Design a binder for this molecule. Structure first.
Ligand SMILES: C[C@@H](Sc1nc(-c2ccc(Cl)cc2)c(C#N)c(=O)[nH]1)C(=O)Nc1ccc(S(N)(=O)=O)cc1
Ligand SMILES: [Zn+2]
Length: 261
């Protein structure tokens, strides 16, 4: 990706991606709007199994598009199973998409409603051996999406907020061990699920999306810090990292299933 020039600006944003990544106009692109009245309850959907007790976080990185908290995925330490999934999916990293204003920022929307931000916990199907192989498969990834609304602070998110000062610009990283991702989950695991894609280039259609119905609340101060990050690298003109979200894409020939009535 040494030649990738896509971003979220007026000249390289979502409306431009299809030129370098034609799959942008594909048949199972993400995100999508979740029409709650049209999603159908699927009683055959098993409860989701989130096992993060042995999670091993390693580093946090500002990659110029968002910041990723990375985990050791060389063993089954933090995995997602159940729900619409068959097999074991390992957590490799999580990141967020957020806006410049509290009224926007999420990628998925619920009945057209936009949340302040959206957390993506990325997992890959272990039957494919490694993440690189997994993204080339229709069932290679499982991304657990969680909406963030502004209200009370999320205690479990503060460690992330406090380290952002050290990775302000593109390419900067910092040790980030012993972070417990369980502190970012809502109480309920009720969810909607549909087959989709990565929401940023290469936009590969390798994701089973699992979006939780219950958002978590974060404080205005917490999301404000997210907005102080930079898309640019150090020593370059400052461009605040905000509105790094892709808008809802056509649902086309897909049905969103709900795990609850
Ligand atoms: C790095 C890219 S795709 C990719 N990633 C990798 C890769 C594999 C492992 C690591 Cl540590 C880093 C990169 C390889 C390899 N090897 C590869 O061939 N392709 C990626 O993972 N982007 C990505 C992830 C989630 C989402 S989202 N918003 O849908 O959750 C969007 C884009
Ligand atoms: Zn994402």
């Amino acid at each position: 990706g040494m030649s990738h020039h896509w971003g979220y600006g007026k000249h390289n944003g979502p409306e431009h991606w299809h030129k370098d990544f034609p799959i942008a106009k594909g048949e199972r692109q993400s995100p999508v709007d979740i029409d709650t009245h049209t999603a159908k309850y699927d009683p055959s959907l098993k409860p989701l199994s989130v096992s993060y007790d042995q999670a091993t976080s390693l580093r946090i990185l500002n990659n110029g598009h968002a910041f990723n908290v990375e985990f050791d995925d060389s063993q089954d330490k933090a995995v997602l199973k159940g729900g619409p999934l068959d097999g074991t999916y390992r957590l490799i990293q999580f990141h967020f998409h957020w806006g410049s204003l509290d009224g926007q920022g999420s990628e998925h929307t619920v009945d057209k409603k936009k949340y302040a931000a959206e957390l993506h916990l990325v997992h890959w199907n272990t039957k494919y051996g490694d993440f690189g192989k997994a993204v080339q498969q229709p069932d290679g990834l499982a991304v657990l999406g969680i909406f963030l609304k502004v209200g009370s602070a999320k205690p479990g998110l503060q460690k992330v907020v406090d380290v952002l000062d050290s990775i302000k610009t593109k390419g900067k990283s910092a040790d980030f061990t012993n972070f417990d991702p369980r502190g970012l989950l809502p109480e309920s695991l009720d969810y909607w699920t549909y087959p989709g894609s990565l929401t940023t280039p290469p936009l590969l259609e390798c994701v089973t999306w699992i979006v939780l119905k219950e958002p978590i609340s974060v404080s205005s101060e917490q999301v404000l810090k997210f907005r102080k990050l930079n898309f640019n690298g150090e020593g370059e003109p400052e461009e605040l990292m905000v509105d790094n979200w892709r808008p809802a894409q056509p649902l086309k020939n897909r049905q969103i299933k709900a795990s609850f009535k």
